[model samples]
Target chain A: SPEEQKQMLGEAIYPKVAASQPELAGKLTGMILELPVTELLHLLEESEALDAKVNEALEVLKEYQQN
Target chain B: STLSPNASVFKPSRS
Candidate 1:
């Protein structure tokens, strides 16, 4: 399930709003997708923490997902 | 629902 914050971003959870929505596959990586389908839903929550960190800093940059 | 608060915490979402 891809729950990007593009259209529904109440407060711009991510500073780097993609020029356009990323391909479903492109939007995910790491252990998140590796999990089973049912488990993947929970994985999405983990990313929420990452969002918190970025929002807390008030950063506005690109390539947040870049490792 | 809320992204503004966490938009800057991580690697910095691409603008």
Candidate 2:
């Protein structure tokens, strides 16, 4: 059921990320989907951490894209 | 660091 869990988590997160950073929403959602279900649930619970993680991911992605 | 090897490949469709 990991696929279903991914779908559900994506639904929960997409709107939130899109509200502030629409450009990065899809990419962030894709990156978050790579995490396990347990981690995804924890991220859902810790809303503040979610933003931090997203920002961290953006930095990582930027570096990846540059190099 | 939770992202897997396939993370980059699993990008959302622009369409």
Candidate 3:
């Protein structure tokens, strides 16, 4: 059962990050399992997508402001 | 030129 969990974790986590940082393949799978899903999801809800959205929106507003 | 949105989506933990 433990081995099965390891395999599933490796498959799920690696694909999420490996395309951008190929060196982080199998190694990060183990590392990812070390943390709680809640901590990550909380940080994600507050940070990742919002930062990009706000930054892009402000950039667009800047162009209009300059006109 | 439009730049790629290199916004970091995820960061490695400090542990």
Candidate 4:
């Protein structure tokens, strides 16, 4: 089920993001929560890609904050 | 590889 998989991926992502961006871990986790399961699975396995996605999330946040 | 079944179902709503 997508819901179950989303829950599992959320759990897996938090710690990894928290390791590098403790302050924004929660926000980043929420941001990626709706990502497709394929992307979520890739994020879990690929550290570099995960970081890229985190960076993308940060940019999105910045745009929101600027408004 | 083929896209997952959910690939089109939920895309990142990057806005």
Best by DockQ: 2
Q: Which pairs of residues collide in candidate 3?
A: none
lDDT by residue for model 2 over A3-33, one digit each (tens)? Answer: 7678777778777777767887777777877
Indicate which candidate wins on TM-score: 2
Candidate 4 clashes between residue pairs 3 or more apart in a chain or in different chains: none
Writing each residue's lDDT as its tens digit, candidate 1 over A1-67 gives: 2334222231232222222223311232221222244433333356654444333322322334432
Candidate 2 regions exceeding 4 Å error are B4-15
Q: lDDT-based ranking, best first? A: 2, 4, 3, 1
Off by over 4 Å in 1: A1-31, A46-67, B1-15
Alpha-carbon local distance difference test for all models:
0.30, 0.71, 0.41, 0.71
After superposition, the stretches of candidate 4 with alpha carbons farther than 4 Å from their true spots are B1-15
The fnat scores of all predictions, in order, read 0.02, 0.27, 0.00, 0.00
Give the TM-score of each candidate: 0.21, 0.77, 0.36, 0.75
Model 2: reference contacts kept, as a fraction: 0.27
Write candidate 3's Cα lDDT for A1-67 as tens digits: 7545544444545455455446533343344344345533442355454234334434543454575
Q: What are the per-residue Cα lDDT tens digits for candidate 3 across B1-15?
A: 131222222233334
Q: Give the alpha carbon lDDT tens digit for every residue of A1-67 in model 4.
A: 8776786678788788888888877777767766888988899999998898878776776766775
Report the C-alpha lDDT of model 2 over B1-15, residue by residue, as the tens digit: 655323632333334
- Fill in the DockQ of model 3: 0.07
Q: To one decimal place, how large is model 4's interface RMSD in Å?
A: 10.2
